[PDB]
Amino acid sequence: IIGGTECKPHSRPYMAYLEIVTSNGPSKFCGGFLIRRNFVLTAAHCAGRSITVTLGAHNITEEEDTWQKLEVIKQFRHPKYNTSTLHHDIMLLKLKEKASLTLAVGTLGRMCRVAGWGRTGVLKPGSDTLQEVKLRLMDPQACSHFRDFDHNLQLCVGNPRKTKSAFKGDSGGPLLCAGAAQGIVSYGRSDAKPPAVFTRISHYQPWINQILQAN
Numbered sequence: 001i002i003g004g005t006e007c008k009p010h011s012r013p014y015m016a017y018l019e020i021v022t023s024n025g026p027s028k029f030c031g032g033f034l035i036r037r038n039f040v041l042t043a044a045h046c047a048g049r050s051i052t053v054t055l056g057a058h059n060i061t062e063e064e065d066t067w068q069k070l071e072v073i074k075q076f077r078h079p080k081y082n083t084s085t086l087h088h089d090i091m092l093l094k095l096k097e098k099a100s101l102t103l104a105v106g107t108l109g110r111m112c113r114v115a116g117w118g119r120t121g122v123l124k125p126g127s128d129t130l131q132e133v134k135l136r137l138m139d140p141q142a143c144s145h146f147r148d149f150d151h152n153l154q155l156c157v158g159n160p161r162k163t164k165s166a167f168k169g170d171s172g173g174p175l176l177c178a179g180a181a182q183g184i185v186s187y188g189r190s191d192a193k194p195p196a197v198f199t200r201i202s203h204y205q206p207w208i209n210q211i212l213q214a215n
């Protein structure tokens, strides 16, 4: 998160920190959010050979009693996900067991909010703490330069006259507008100039329900 502020610890108890393993590189990291006690929603580009989810985190460097580190048994990447266009950048992770509900862990032109442990600048490392930024939902014309952006599938997020933005490592986290999840961090410019592209969750609700009912 660029231009955000550190959250009060555990103030976003649905937030999930993902560590993604690949067979041919080191760990990669994403966000996500707990939508059922045994399901996490995130971005399809966060898929890997294996994933561990950490719920209840604030400072991801300092293990504490709120932590619940949970195995993912199965990854459900949207079947039309496209690795070039990042159309349909959405994925459900089924956890091996249902999470415990605690104070720190629970399920989930207007201004929306996005939180994450990602980089705090183009050349800065990922944040040790959960950060949150308020971003403006933009008309789709603001994202035209993203040639594969589609207004029906995606949201256009972030005033280009502000530096505020999600960035690397924030992929998969939710954009909340009026306390409801509307977007998923997907992609943007390498130089972090807003706006960025989010997955429009509403489009995918039938697919989400289909997976949840079959698993």
Ligand SMILES: Cc1c(Cn2c(=O)c(C(=O)O)cn(-c3ccc4c(c3)n(C)c(=O)n4C)c2=O)cccc1C(F)(F)F
Pocket (backbone or CB within 6 Å): 084, 085, 086, 146, 147, 148, 165, 166, 167, 168, 169, 170, 171, 185, 186, 187, 188, 189, 190, 192, 196, 197
């Ligand atoms: C995740 C992210 C990123 C990361 N990022 C890169 O850093 C990056 C690079 O080259 O280093 C490239 N991409 C990329 C990924 C996909 C892209 C695409 C660009 N463009 C321009 C495009 O049309 N597609 C489909 C990235 O998404 C940048 C800005 C914002 C955000 C977000 F959090 F807001 F989503």
Ligand SMILES: *[C@@H]1O[C@H](CO)[C@@H](O[C@@H]2O[C@H](CO)[C@@H](O)[C@H](O)[C@H]2NC(C)=O)[C@H](O)[C@H]1NC(C)=O
Pocket (backbone or CB within 6 Å): 059, 060, 061, 062, 128, 129
């Ligand atoms: C997040 O937690 C880590 C671990 O407690 C903190 O890292 C310590 O930070 C101090 C000074 O910032 C260093 O001198 C120590 O060496 C660090 N310890 C370890 C184990 O690396 C970090 O400051 C915390 N970040 C917060 C709360 O913002």
Ligand SMILES: *[C@@H]1O[C@H](CO)[C@@H](O[C@@H]2O[C@H](CO)[C@@H](O)[C@H](O)[C@H]2NC(C)=O)[C@H](O)[C@H]1NC(C)=O
Pocket (backbone or CB within 6 Å): 080, 081, 082, 083, 084, 085
């Ligand atoms: C991912 O999306 C790309 C971009 O649309 C697809 O590539 C296009 O596929 C159509 C249909 O085969 C062709 O007519 C275009 O020429 C292709 N364009 C490019 C730039 O290659 C691609 O097929 C998709 N991949 C998957 C597996 O979904």
Ligand SMILES: [Zn+2]
Pocket (backbone or CB within 6 Å): 009, 010, 058, 064, 066
């Ligand atoms: Zn704590």
